[PDB]
Design a protein around this ligand. Sequence first.
Ligand SMILES: Nc1ncnc2c1ncn2[C@@H]1O[C@H](COP(=O)(O)OP(=O)(O)O)[C@@H](O)[C@H]1O
Ligand SMILES: Nc1ncnc2c1ncn2[C@@H]1O[C@H](COP(=O)(O)OP(=O)(O)O)[C@@H](O)[C@H]1O
Ligand SMILES: [Cl-]
Ligand SMILES: [Mg+2]
Ligand SMILES: [Mg+2]
Lengths: 233, 235
Amino acid sequence: SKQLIYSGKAKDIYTTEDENLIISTYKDQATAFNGVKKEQIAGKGVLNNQISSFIFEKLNVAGVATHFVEKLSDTEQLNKKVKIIPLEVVLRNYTAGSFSKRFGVDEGIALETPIVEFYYKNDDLDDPFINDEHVKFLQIAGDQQIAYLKEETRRINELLKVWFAEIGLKLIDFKLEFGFDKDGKIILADEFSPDNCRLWDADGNHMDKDVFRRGLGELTDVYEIVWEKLQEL
Amino acid sequence: MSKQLIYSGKAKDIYTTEDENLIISTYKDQATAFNGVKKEQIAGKGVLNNQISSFIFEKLNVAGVATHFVEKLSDTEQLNKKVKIIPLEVVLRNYTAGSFSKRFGVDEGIALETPIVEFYYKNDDLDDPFINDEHVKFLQIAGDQQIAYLKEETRRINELLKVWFAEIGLKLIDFKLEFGFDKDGKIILADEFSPDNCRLWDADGNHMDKDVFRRGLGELTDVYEIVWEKLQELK
Ligand SMILES: Nc1ncnc2c1ncn2[C@@H]1O[C@H](COP(=O)(O)OP(=O)(O)O)[C@@H](O)[C@H]1O
Ligand SMILES: Nc1ncnc2c1ncn2[C@@H]1O[C@H](COP(=O)(O)OP(=O)(O)O)[C@@H](O)[C@H]1O
Ligand SMILES: [Cl-]
Ligand SMILES: [Mg+2]
Ligand SMILES: [Mg+2]
């Protein structure tokens, strides 16, 4: 029992007795594209929290610095409290969704090298896509910081891509958040579940949130499958 | 004036010459809004535009900027060096207005220091979407050293344009360049610099450009003329 700091779409965050620490609670809320149509869909919190807890641990073992300490419940994990960088970092391995739209090209076209993209994490501005100078202007981060957010998201792609391969899933794209820990450094934060990455079955089957949005099945099912596959590592 | 068409634009029909390397550009009386959506014929526009562009482009040439400009042929035409165009539209911003205002949710009118440069892919089917460096490399448009060149050149270009407009009392909010490759593969400033292509606020905040057409505040050639007049007071 402690205090609710922020209330999200997928997560409520609570405090502890340790200033630097925060327990994250994964909700059953699902919400579609920016025009937030809202459905609450059972089990989702637990899968997300499992998957995220797993990958994050795997990262930590691989020496990626992150906010993960321990999965504490079905529903909760304990995280190092960081000051969030309002900059969603998207790395793309394959064309899909908004890249496809922007460039009027199909989804499934491989890239090599992979492209990163910043978006201003500002719900009111509809999380707009931005460039390096816009970030500087925004005073989120200067140079050296911009080049760090790239350089580590790529390293993160390289680990993650290999792992999903080994369980027969192609890492199409994902989306990070980073923030500052009590010591000022930058640190992978938030969560890495099927909600914030794309996952393609070797047969093009979507093992991710595109099931809720495009509407190609029931969500917990594909998530269940991904969770099942991950414990093959 | 009689040779063949190379391509028709929304603002410019560009013709061939006997000189492979030279193009004669024809400025039209046509004005088109947002995503090519609404258009009108407005008389005098091409002429008005043709002088402004030739004049600015000349001044650039004398202040040491490589460009596609050779001479003004007449009311409606100028002669230009043929370039393989770079299908990037390069926007420099000094003050906030329009799209930057839209995306970032703040007012038209706030000074930026430093000025922001923004690439859009010149591809009308895609509505010239906004792109970032890595998309340009993707698109195979330029390598790094070249994107750096487009930047540093559009900057020293602002740092001339802003002054000249200052001296005649004009606020260079933003503009929009296009560069291309000359006969010897050198990047070179080209297309046009008219008020279709930039923002110029009055000291009273009055719109001395195509925003008159877009936001339908009144008629375009009034303002365009005022700028032509003002520009003629320079050197
Ligand atoms: N270590 C952390 N410290 C503080 N805030 C965090 C941390 N990790 C994640 N967050 C934030 O917690 C919020 C969780 O709510 P969520 O529903 O994920 O947000 P969103 O609706 O933006 O996806 C997010 O805004 C995220 O930035
Ligand atoms: N020196 C040049 N050589 C060849 N093409 C050019 C040159 N300058 C401009 N262009 C191209 O000619 C076309 C001019 O038509 P215009 O109406 O200005 O285009 P748009 O409708 O895209 O604004 C554009 O596609 C432009 O990039
Ligand atoms: Cl955009
Ligand atoms: Mg989130
Ligand atoms: Mg043009």
